[PDB]
Structure 1
Amino acid sequence: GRYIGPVCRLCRREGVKLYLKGERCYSPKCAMERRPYPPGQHGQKRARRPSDYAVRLREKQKLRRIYGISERQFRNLFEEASKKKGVTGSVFLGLLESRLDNVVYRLGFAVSRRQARQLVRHGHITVNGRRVDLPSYRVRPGDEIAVAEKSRNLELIRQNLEAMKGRKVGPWLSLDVEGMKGKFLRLPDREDLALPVNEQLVIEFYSR
């Protein structure tokens, strides 16, 4: 099963602020606004010039840890993107962003990918009316991602759909906020996302 364990703790280590808690990893602390250095006894000591490997490792750990996905599943996605037509960097990100668990979070229904995961798992989500409890499910374009009518009354869905009052959603998505349902209009270009990650390093990491 997916990671399960301390989080705004690679918010640390990986240098950059990763958004794995959503509400707090967002507000005087991803723990990161207090301690911007690696975890552990050595965290605050002159970091050593990183090896080409270290670098490429880190960048891929970053990207992976962001989406909360496991190495085996991440890897197969990468290999899938590699076979496919077109810039194999973006494509991967295309696929990574097509995971229902993510879309749901991109759509505001959840505040975290991790929390989005639980929503999808416990039946609270529905693709094209039919419901779907697989975090890995590939959302294709055209697909309507609703919330489960039965699940609507829940405090949690309410808050998140209410705090989406004002909010704006990525160019590849749309969102009827009242009907608690969004849409997947097309797959995101690299430019559509602002990820702290140079995928050129990731492709590179999977080359040896």
Structure 2
Amino acid sequence: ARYLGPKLKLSRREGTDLFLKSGVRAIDTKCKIEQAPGQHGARKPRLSDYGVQLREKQKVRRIYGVLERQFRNYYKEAARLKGNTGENLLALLEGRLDNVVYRMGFGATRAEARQLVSHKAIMVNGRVVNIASYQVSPNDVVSIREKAKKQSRVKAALELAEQREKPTWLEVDAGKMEGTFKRKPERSDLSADINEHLIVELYSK
């Protein structure tokens, strides 16, 4: 129930950055960033209205690695809630446990953040949480437990967090390798390449 294929092949499909590797080696030095994979990947078609709504939703899933049914459950939850549904939807996406570990930069990629939660190396409010898709409540702490603090892939990811923009809604520590979920973020606190007014309409035919 995971994607296991080539990561940058998905980047070549959507054509934009998906942050799927550590960014140490330059991304364009690993793939033609503006050719879709395979034979007929150079020629850009007159892409239709249906496709760009699909490609937008296929972007956001492949941003966070979320399969369709479980992603649809987020849509059902966000539609049940109040206000802007896409802002509610992104909050659910930011509510993911394996997201915040990448947002705290403890794992270099989200999949490198996910394996840690899979291999039980995390403590949330002092409690180990095996589920990567767990929804993070506000004002909680996410601490590396002391079995796998000594992994070299932890502290090298901390430097990659220094390379990235530091998020705002995360009171993150370094010496204890812990953090604190301050508050929920905004639409504005995330990127602008994700349209609110498309992923709603795709699931509202």
Q: TM-score range by the shorter chain?
A: over 0.9
Q: TM-score, normalised by structure 1?
A: 0.92
Aligned AA for 1:128?
N
Distance in 2 of aligned mates of 1:30 and 1:105: 24
CA-to-partner distance for each residue in 1:67-90, whole Å, 9 max, x for gaps? 011111111001100110121011
Distance in 1 of aligned mates of 2:137 and 2:38: 42
Q: CA deviation at 1:183?
A: 0.9
Q: Check the 8 A contact 2:11/2:33 in 1, yes or no.
A: no
CA RMSD of aligned residues (A): 1.8
Task: List, as ranges, runs of 4+ consecutive aligned residues in structure 1 with deviation greater than 6 Å.
Answer: none
Aligned match for 1:37, one of 18, 32, 35: 35
Partner of 1:70: 67
How many residue pairs end up in the alignment? 205
Give 5+ residue unaligned stretches, structure 2.
Answer: none
Q: Find the residue that maps to 1:12 and give its secondary structure.
A: helix
Q: Check the 8 A contact 1:169/1:175 in 2, yes or no.
A: no
Distance in 2 of aligned mates of 1:97 and 1:30: 30
Distance in 2 of aligned mates of 1:87 and 1:156: 38
Aligned match for 1:109, one of 106, 117, 126: 106
Structure 1 or 2: more helix by fraction: 2
Q: CA deviation at 1:170?
A: 0.8
Overall identity of the aligned pairs, in %: 48
Out of 1-10 and 164-173, give the one that drifted further: 164-173
Q: Find the residue that maps to 2:41 and give its secondary structure.
A: coil
Partner of 1:85: 82
Q: CA deviation at 1:187?
A: 1.0
Distance in 1 of aligned mates of 2:160 and 2:41: 36
CA-to-partner distance for each residue in 1:34-82, whole Å, 9 max, x for gaps? 341211100012x222221111111000011000111111110011001
After superposition, the Cα gap between the structure-2 partners of 1:206 and 1:31, relative to the gap in structure 1 and judged at 3 Å, is farther
Partner of 2:194: 197
Partner of 1:94: 91
Partner of 1:59: 56
Q: TM-score, normalised by structure 2?
A: 0.93
After superposition, the Cα gap between the structure-2 partners of 1:56 and 1:168, relative to the gap in structure 1 and judged at 3 Å, is closer
Q: CA deviation at 1:162?
A: 4.9
Give 5+ residue unaligned stretches, structure 1.
Answer: none
Distance in 2 of aligned mates of 1:28 and 1:168: 18
After superposition, the Cα gap between the structure-2 partners of 1:130 and 1:30, relative to the gap in structure 1 and judged at 3 Å, is farther
